[PDB]
């Protein structure tokens, strides 16, 4: 990207004056997000302003940070609108910093959201959620991922921290900087040493560098475990340095406390050693729907 100079796309281009920057939201690693006001997005009612989130490069940006930003933008162009995916609102691509303008989620990411609602239990440290609530979180994220897979897209970074919660408590998948398009190819091969959090990586992705929708399913299993620990961190006590060996020996996380055996069996299913023997996101959606219907 050190000189692939960005083209223009009038469909998505929003002039920089129609954007007013304010408080910073997220931080760290590959970029930076600030809260902003956008003047006349939907056009047909062009004098109202919308609260939006703006992704941009941070202070000491690297080539790959920029590459990731651009890629996130284009990927979100390809994916399209869906109820459970933070969708693209616009972009500032010419004559200044790259600005990727996306939907704003007032209630933060799923991990924070879940941790803010932990009952005063012994396995821990707002108002609590019912079982049907959590299972509905799982269901929503599953819908989003099913849609992603229908569009031949691999997220590669599916985790609680990358799921956002809206004002109406809707789940919306975010962070597409590492997302890859696998239209008309069997898999995606990763660089020699990856840039994705190890504890969410499927074994075939960690050891062999193969990414498919199935590895995303693995990640979703870890996400289930995160949801029903109400924001716990995967493989508690286990340092990354020691996870490898464990995974190569068949180690799997235990059943979280407040969790049915059906859901833990779903987690274990997502964590199958053989990728092809894992459920698809469609099957996961069907299952989670069935379970939602049988819960209160």
Residue numbers in the entry: 460 to 584, 592 to 762
Which of the paper's sentences describe this entry?
Importantly, aberrant FGF/FGFR signaling has been linked to several developmental syndromes and a broad range of human malignancies. The involvement in the pathology of many cancer types provides a strong rationale for development of effective agents for these targets; consequently, there is a large ongoing effort to develop FGFR inhibitors as anticancer treatments. A number of crystal structures of FGFR KD in non-phosphorylated and phosphorylated forms have been reported. The 3D-structures highlighted the features that undergo substantial changes and play a key role in the activation process; of particular importance is the A-loop and so called “molecular brake”.
The residue corresponding to R669 in FGFR3 is conserved and also mutated in all other FGFRs in cancer as well as in FGFR2 in bone dysplasia. To assess the mechanism that underpins activation, we first analyzed the R to G replacement in the context of FGFR1 KD that is more amenable to crystallography compared to FGFR3 KD. R675G FGFR1 KD variant also has higher activity compared to the WT. Notably, in the inactive FGFR1 KD there is direct hydrogen bonding between R675 and H650 from the A-loop; in addition, R675 is found to share a tight van der Waals interaction with active site tyrosine Y653 and H650 (bottom left inset). These interactions are disturbed and broken in R675G mutant (top inset), thus favoring the A-loop to adopt an open conformation as found in the active FGFR1-3P (bottom right inset). In turn, this open conformation of the A-loop leads to several rearrangements of various control elements in the KD – including ordering of spine residues, dissociation in the molecular brake interacting residues, repositioning of the αC-helix and movement of the N-lobe toward the C-lobe. We suggest a similar allosteric mechanism for FGFR1 R675G and corresponding FGFR3 R669G mutation that is in this case triggered by the loss of inhibitory interactions in the vicinity of the A-loop that involve the R675/669 residue. Moreover, we have established that an infrequent cancer mutation corresponding to R669G in FGFR3, also found in bone dysplasia, greatly enhances kinase activity of FGFR. Nevertheless, structural studies of this mutation in the context of FGFR1 KD (R675G) are fully consistent with its activating potential. Furthermore, we here reveal a new feature of FGFR KD that stabilizes the inactive conformation which, when disrupted by mutations, can result in activation – namely, a set of interactions in the vicinity of the A-loop that involve R669/675.
